[PDB]
Design a protein around this ligand. Structure first.
Ligand SMILES: CCCCCCCCCCCCC/C=C\[C@H](O)[C@H](N)CO
Ligand SMILES: *C(=O)CCCCCCCCCCCCC
Ligand SMILES: *C(=O)CCCCCCCCCCCCC
Ligand SMILES: *C(=O)CCCCCCCCCCCCC
Lengths: 60, 5, 268, 283, 235, 60, 235, 235, 60, 5, 5
């Protein structure tokens, strides 16, 4: 049940990996993976009904 | 066994 | 059924005895388990068991009691209530060990103008509370075991204040189910209700229940039968109505081990 | 194959009805509870149910250590007139009330028992003397084995009895024990006696307590401070926590509604009125 | 030795933990189970059984057999309540001590549908129509049939099928309600009214009791285990 | 001898699993799996000899 | 280091534990075993061997050779007991010090069948029939042949086969009995009676001894190891 | 037991650690998520939203609505600044409390391009050309259009497209700048000038406001999490 | 080098197993397996030269 | 080796 | 690797 993931190696001395085994039944007990996703800011930066083309006039 | 990401 | 068969009309036959009823409210099989003989994989005493079959697995009718407006309720213990019943009782007292299931049939008819409702409960290990606040767990064997006459519930706890010669009997308070738990919850035990407008009987088929495959019937009661008026007897405008309650109980799949001379208990 | 953590049934959408099917009408005399669901008596929408009964499985309901006793011991100056106190406790879940009430929702049970021991100590006299770190011996003395009469007598050798030597200030001690009953299940209630009174025998001779089976059901724990007497007296307490692991239960019972009064089902006068006043037509 | 580094939580005793530990009685010969009847696998099974409600907790009726009896009579039709009850299954004094109420007091949160079944215990000759109501929270609690009619209800016709059931469907803002009196997670109002009136012939009792039962539906669940207030040990 | 089971993941940050190895000979020493089964309440809620059909009269 | 978290039970010494530990004498040249006769693999093997019962623990006979001798004589037939014994193999004073009784006192629980074998030590010319009885518990303990006859028994005819065995079959309510006197786990009654009488010709001793032995059957077992009360070390 | 050797760091509590720990509420029934609108996955998403700049923090205008209003008028052309601002997004008092500035105060380091957008709030009849400037650091901060012209700039023509954006491109010696006032990691100068002048017809307001907004570009990032000075709890 | 054996499971909540690794060179350092054998009592209960048939006379 | 549930 | 009993 071991999970093997790669580290993003910053300062250097192949891929360096690290290992993780969950010891508990409850997922709440797990550490944080930090394997997170990004999204586009559009729902906040461009919430307009008609798609914005930045080279065009915003008002036409 | 082992998962790999 | 289109050929007339009904939930309300039943016939039960065990040994040389038959019960009929025309106003049943179906019948209950406690915990969905029909009585059975002890299986080899669960067996414990190794001697050949005695299995009296029809000689003991038949309907025995106990003494009829009377329901009135002041009735608080009645109780019996099994096998105790049947200890003097024909060859069942003999087989019981001649053997160290015994196990048995039961068909319990409570009978109480009245009329379309009477009303009242009896809760009929079968309780595994029906330990009742004693009359004492000077000594706990003090109810004597003789008082714990009334035989067929059974015992009664009371609406009032009254502590035995005679310290010199204590009564040593139960003081089973009705709303506390005689054991310190609320009666409204007794329905988690296998039960039926005799509600006079609906039915005139209760039928409970009880498996042998215990933390052992077989045990001392003389030392230990497996089941308790508790009958309490959930709704009081009432009739027309009579102030003092009475209707009888009769218990008929049949042992089922009973077997006994450890044969010797007969037990002669101190019952008074 | 249905597991405790499975989602409960979905609500299925249901519309108006006008028929001879009568789900709402029933007859509780039969001894049965009417198996209804909302779509039987009202119009429902479709709902995908995600909730589960995982936390109310018998295992989960009991999966907690409960305190069942507090044992007191000490280690006095050698010069004292009073004997060094060692403790003896008859193992039971009935000296406290909370775990007892939970187990008593059922008539019988089977389980492996986990015992955890929390140990605390303090000074008693307004002294200024110190005491070095104490080691405690928790010895299980099963029915039949010699119970210790003195903090230092031969029984504490434990050649065959299991003992825990606990060091003060370390993690609380813990052991497990299998299902050790002499029956196929533990009886939370025994409607009977351990003796038959015979006519040919005196009443005293045939007598025994109501509802009591083996006088020494499970034996005792005997606890002592192993350290020799110290000029300054220290008193300690050992709190015992019981957790039923790997549990099975049979025959449900109404819960205890009035205060416990002894190891049996007895009740005390003046404690029999749990319910409070509330008017029939008042919300 | 294997290089190890002790983390926070080390040496604590959490009473809800789930670890292995050494057996004090190794190689012990365990007695096998037998097939005892009545095995329970989940506490909600017990909550699905009907237990009887102590509806009438008046000063003289409480803590007596009478508390379970709701008295009806053949009086002329009224639009006034036979009984009124709050849907607070763990905390309303009429529900909190039923088997359902009791199990709910070992948990912080409850959810799902419930059902109330009433049993008519009058004589066969007695007839009647009653209205059983559930009003979800947020308006004036029904004190008259006119309001109760507007909510969830069953009009019960008394007859051979002795009993009648009203299902209180899970209708809530929150995904779980609290097992205490709480306005934010309030459940609403249960009430019973005369729809026509109880009618009896002559030579018949003019007053009778109905009994009421509550149980959980198959969609009912509880969570966050906790200690109950329904037992204590002062000293 | 490792046992690998899945966690029911509640709050999220595939299947997340956890690992279990029993260290002792006696099953009494084992932790609780919490991998438990449910059953139907019928032995308590419907203990009647004749099967109940809820749309039908309970008494016929 | 590997992140670790110390659990309860850490650093305790349980005397029944079963862990590895460092060897103080590494690479030690162990002397090999040889095939010594009489190897034992299980304590119950010893319990299956017949050892002799100290039946007569009277004030003058106890702790002497005489305690093992049960005296019979050619007196006229009686229905009165030669001996009476309780089936409490670890606690009845006549059984508790037999090899079976001794091993049982290192355990809390026992179960299984037992057997009693009696040896007639009179002369060849002496004849007799005796009745050996086992009454399971719960009735009046047999004091007369009439009662003892009704339970488990063997009628022993004395002759060339010098000895006779009565098997006490496992007949119990509980799956294991306690190794102390306990009413709930009581075993019942062992007793011996004259069936006819001992008869001798002239020139022959009119009194003689029988000896008795107890041993376990192959279905016999014990559990829950414990310390015995049969040895101590005061000071 | 497995031979282990405790390493440095053992038993410490690092508040930034990431270890497993026992669950205090095992088998808890978690309420599922629903699809709530507005989920955020990264704090820089918030930094990419335009928030309004409190440009005018004069003693009378600060901490009032007026601080956000930059007043322009139709006065004759001047080469003197409408506003002057330091590119110190976390520490210059005009930028530090914008949403960008606020998020930057939870981090030690920032990097990437930014953008300033100005909104003309005069009447439709008002016209004008303005010059928006960014001077990278190291020379005299621009106080006259003549200097500001020589750096990065946008000449804004006022008209139907109400607003105009100047991008401050990432131009830095270091790979990340500090989120405090620091000469070594200074960012340079933002300023606005009149390119021609605001012109209005008659019957028209001669003074009006422009509003300004700042937001991060898609190449913008922060690092080294830290506590902010923008909140405290004295006592 | 892991040894995997089964537990005799007494109270229940497949085969449950447990794992054992020996950490030391000396077998004396090992825990006890408790995987022990039984034998027939005959060398003590029936040490007679001629085999005993229990239904037959012991003396003939 | 490894069981998987 | 692994022995199995
Ligand atoms: C070194 C410490 C070892 C401790 C060993 C404790 C062994 C004794 C186990 C006792 C089991 C108690 C179970 C609870 C009570 C029973 O259920 C009821 N009274 C019915 O039999
Ligand atoms: C998947 O996990 C199979 C590989 C197992 C590797 C060794 C596990 C190390 C110890 C984990 C113990 C269990 C934690 C409760
Ligand atoms: C099955 O268990 C084979 C895989 C072994 C994985 C590593 C075991 C980790 C340490 C267990 C030590 C033994 C516990 C007594
Ligand atoms: C056989 O052992 C191969 C599998 C190895 C499993 C992991 C071993 C766990 C740590 C043992 C350390 C060595 C003990 C001195």
């Amino acid at each position: 049940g071991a999970q093997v993931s790669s580290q993003k190696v910053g300062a250097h001395e192949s891929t360096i990996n690290y290992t993780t085994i969950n010891y508990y039944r409850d997922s709440a007990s797990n550490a944080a993976s930090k394997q997170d996703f990004s999204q586009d800011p559009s729902k906040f930066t461009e919430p307009i009904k008609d798609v914005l083309i930045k080279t065009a006039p915003m008002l036409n | 066994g082992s998962s790999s990401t | 059924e289109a050929c007339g068969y009904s939930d309300r009309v039943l016939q039960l036959t065990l040994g040389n005895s038959t019960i009929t009823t025309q106003e049943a409210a179906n019948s209950v099989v406690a915990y969905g388990r029909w009585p059975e003989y002890l299986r080899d994989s669960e067996a414990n005493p190794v001697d050949q068991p005695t299995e009296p079959d029809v000689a003991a697995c038949r309907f025995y009718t106990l003494d009829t009691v009377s329901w009135t407006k002041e009735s608080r309720g009645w109780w019996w213990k099994l096998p105790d209530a049947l200890r003097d019943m024909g060859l069942f009782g003999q087989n019981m007292y001649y053997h160290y060990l015994g196990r048995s299931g039961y068909t319990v049939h409570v009978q109480c008819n009245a009329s379309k103008f009477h009303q009242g409702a009896l809760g009929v409960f079968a309780v595994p290990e029906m330990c009742l509370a004693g009359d004492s606040n000077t000594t706990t767990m003090y109810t004597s064997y003789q008082n714990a075991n009334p035989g067929e006459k059974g015992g009664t519930f009371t609406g009032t706890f009254t502590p035995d204040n005679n310290q010199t010669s204590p009564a040593r009997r139960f003081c089973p308070v009705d709303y506390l189910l005689g054991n310190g738990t609320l009666l409204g919850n007794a329905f988690v035990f296998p039960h039926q209700i005799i509600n006079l407008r609906t039915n005139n009987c209760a039928t409970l088929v009880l498996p042998y229940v215990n933390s052992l495959s077989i045990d001392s019937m003389v030392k230990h009661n497996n089941w308790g039968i508790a009958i309490l008026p959930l709704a009081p007897l009432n009739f027309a405008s009579e102030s003092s109505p009475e209707i009888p309650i009769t218990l008929t109980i049949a042992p089922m799949c009973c077997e006994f081990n450890g044969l010797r001379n007969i037990t002669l208990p101190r019952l008074q | 194959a249905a597991t405790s953590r499975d989602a409960l049934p979905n609500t299925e959408a249901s519309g108006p009805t006008h028929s001879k099917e009568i789900p709402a009408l029933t007859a509780v005399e039969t001894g049965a509870t009417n198996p209804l669901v909302p779509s039987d008596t009202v119009q429902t929408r479709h709902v995908v149910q995600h909730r589960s009964r995982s936390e109310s499985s018998i295992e989960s309901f009991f999966a907690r250590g409960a305190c069942v006793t507090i044992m007191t011991v000490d280690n006095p100056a050698s010069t004292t007139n009073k004997d060094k106190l060692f403790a003896v406790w008859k193992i039971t879940y009935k000296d406290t009330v909370q775990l007892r009430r939970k187990l008593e929702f059922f008539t019988y049970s089977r389980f492996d028992m986990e015992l955890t021991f929390v140990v605390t100590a303090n000074f008693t006299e307004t002294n200024n003397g110190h005491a070095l770190n104490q080691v405690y011996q928790i010895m299980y003395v099963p029915p039949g084995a010699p119970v210790p009469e003195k903090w230092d007598d031969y029984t504490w050798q434990t050649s065959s009895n299991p003992s825990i030597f606990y060091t003060y200030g370390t993690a609380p001690a813990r052991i497990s024990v299998p299902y050790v009953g002499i029956s196929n299940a533990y009886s939370h209630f025994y409607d009977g006696f351990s003796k038959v009174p015979l006519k040919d025998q005196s009443a005293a001779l045939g007598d025994s307590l109501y509802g009591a089976a083996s006088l020494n059901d499970f034996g005792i724990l005997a606890v002592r401070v192993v350290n020799d007497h110290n000029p300054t007296k220290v008193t300690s307490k050992i709190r015992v926590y019981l957790k039923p692991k790997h549990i099975r239960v049979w025959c449900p019972r109404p819960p205890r509604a009035v205060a416990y009064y002894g190891p049996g089902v007895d009740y005390k006068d003046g404690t029999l009125t749990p319910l409070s006043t509330k008017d029939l037509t008042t919300y | 030795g294997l290089p190890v580094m002790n983390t926070p939580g080390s040496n604590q005793y959490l009473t809800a933990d789930n670890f292995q530990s050494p057996c004090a009685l190794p190689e012990f010969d365990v007695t096998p189970p037998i097939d005892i009847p009545g095995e329970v696998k989940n506490m909600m099974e017990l909550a699905e059984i009907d237990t009887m409600i102590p509806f009438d907790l008046s000063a003289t009726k409480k803590n007596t057999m009478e508390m379970y009896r709701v008295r009806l009579s053949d009086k002329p039709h009224t639009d006034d309540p036979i009984l009124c009850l709050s849907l607070s299954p763990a905390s309303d004094p009429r529900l909190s001590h039923t088997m359902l109420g009791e199990i709910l007091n070992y948990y912080t949160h409850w959810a799902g549908s419930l059902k109330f079944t009433f049993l008519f215990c009058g004589s066969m000759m007695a007839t009647g129509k009653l209205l059983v109501s559930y009003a979800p929270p947020g308006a004036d609690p029904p004190k008259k049939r006119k309001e109760a009619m507007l909510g969830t209800h069953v009009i019960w016709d008394i007859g051979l099928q002795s009993s009648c059931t009203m299902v209180v469907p899970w209708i809530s803002n929150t995904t779980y309600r609290q097992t205490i009196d709480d306005s934010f997670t309030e459940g609403g109002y249960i009430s019973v009214f005369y729809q026509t009136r109880i009618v009896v012939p002559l030579s018949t009792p003019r007053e009778m009791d109905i009994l009421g039962f509550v149980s959980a539906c198959n969609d009912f669940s509880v969570r966050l285990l906790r200690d109950t207030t329904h037992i204590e040990q002062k000293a």
